[PDB]
């Protein structure tokens, strides 16, 4: 049994009270107060529509993925990754696809900087989408489940779906459950072919073992995964730590 499986078993034993205290213990998070107030009022400038804009910004500002040209955003949801990319100097077009409907977030129309180069299409299940040419491939799909075998299936399906979209382009892909041995086998094969590295984002919650496969980096995937399992396991043992609060992103206004 992997360390990740030990973490998942312990996570599943927590009461709701224990789970709520654990899920943000020692994590980093942006203060969404201003954005949530503005969005409730229907404000369309400055605000990021979700925590995802800051989450992708964390990788971009570290050069782990450098969006450029035509960006595809799979599983765009409200559009946080797409609206953030729309303001980036090298980006020329953003196309987001998301399922929408019951149980799924719908794109939020916004007027943040570069809105005019964004097209968010809902009602689209990416598992039936044929691949398109793009310079940047983003994917943030992977629904958590108390079952790690359900998560394993979900993760392998995303990895198989994204591959034909990868053609010597920039990429950032969520890996929901990176610790199951079958997933590690696929990730090692994918890294041999397309390069990149698996990275844990400090803005992820402790309630998920997600890591992101980014294009600009190198390293040992197994080492990186076990490092996260040990980190998350130890966070159960530690006294509660309020999250490290950071300022949310201002996505401005205007067209380009």
Alpha helices in 100-239 (DSSP H): 148-162, 181-194, 221-237
Interaction between residue 235 and ligand 3A9 (CB under 6 A): yes
Q: Any binding-site annotation on 115?
A: no
Query: Which of the choices ligand SAM, ligand 3A9, Na ion, none does residue 70 contact, using the CB cut-off of 5 to 8 A by kind?
Result: none
- Share of the chain residues as helix, strand and coil, in percent rounded to the nearest 5: 40, 15, 45
Of 98 and 204, CB closest to ligand 3A9: 204
CB proximity list for 190: less than 8 A, separation 6 or greater: 159, 163, 213
Contact partner, 148, from ligand 3A9, ligand SAM, Na ion, none, Cβ < 5-8 Å per class? none
From residue 94 to residue 123, the character string flagging contacts with ligand SAM as x (rule: CB under 6 A) and all else as - is ----xx----xx------------------
Residue 11: CB minimum distance to Na ion, A: 22
Tokens 């916004």 map to which residue? 110
Q: Are 118 and 108 in contact (CB under 8 A)?
A: no
Q: Is 126 in the site for ligand SAM (CB under 6 A)?
A: yes
Collapsed DSSP state (helix, strand, coil) of residue 193: helix
Element (H, E) at 197: strand 197-199
Interface with ligand SAM by CB under 6 A: which residues?
A: 50, 52-53, 75-81, 98-99, 104-105, 124-127, 140-141
Interface with ligand 3A9 by CB under 6 A: which residues?
A: 26, 231, 234-235
Residues annotated within a binding site: 50, 80-81, 98-99, 104-105, 125-126, 212
């Amino acid at each position: 049994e992997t360390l990740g499986e030990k973490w998942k078993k312990k996570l599943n034993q927590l009461s709701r009270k224990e789970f709520d205290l654990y899920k943000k213990s020692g994590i980093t998070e942006v203060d969404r107060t201003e954005a949530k107030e503005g969005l409730k009022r229907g404000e369309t400038t400055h605000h990021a529509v979700s925590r995802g804009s800051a989450k992708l910004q964390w990788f971009v500002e570290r050069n782990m993925v450098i969006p450029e040209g035509r960006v595809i955003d799979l599983g765009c949801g409200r559009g946080g990754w797409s609206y953030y990319c729309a303001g980036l100097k090298k980006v020329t077009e953003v196309r987001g696809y998301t399922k929408g409907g019951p149980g799924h977030e719908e794109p939020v129309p916004m007027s943040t900087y570069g809105w005019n180069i964004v097209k968010l299409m809902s009602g689209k299940d990416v598992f039936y989408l044929p691949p398109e040419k793009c310079d940047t491939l983003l994917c943030d799909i992977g629904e958590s489940s108390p079952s790690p075998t359900v998560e394993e299936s979900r993760t392998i399906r995303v990895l198989k779906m994204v591959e034909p979209w990868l053609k010597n382009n920039q990429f950032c892909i969520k890996v929901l459950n990176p610790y199951m041995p079958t997933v590690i086998e696929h990730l090692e094969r994918l890294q041999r072919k397309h390069g990149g590295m698996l990275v844990r984002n400090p803005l992820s919650r402790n309630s998920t073992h997600e890591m992101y496969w980014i294009s600009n980096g190198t390293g040992n995937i197994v080492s990186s995964v076990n490092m996260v399992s040990r980190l998350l396991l130890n966070r159960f043992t530690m006294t509660h730590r309020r999250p490290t609060i950071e300022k949310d992103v201002d996505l401005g206004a205007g067209t380009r």
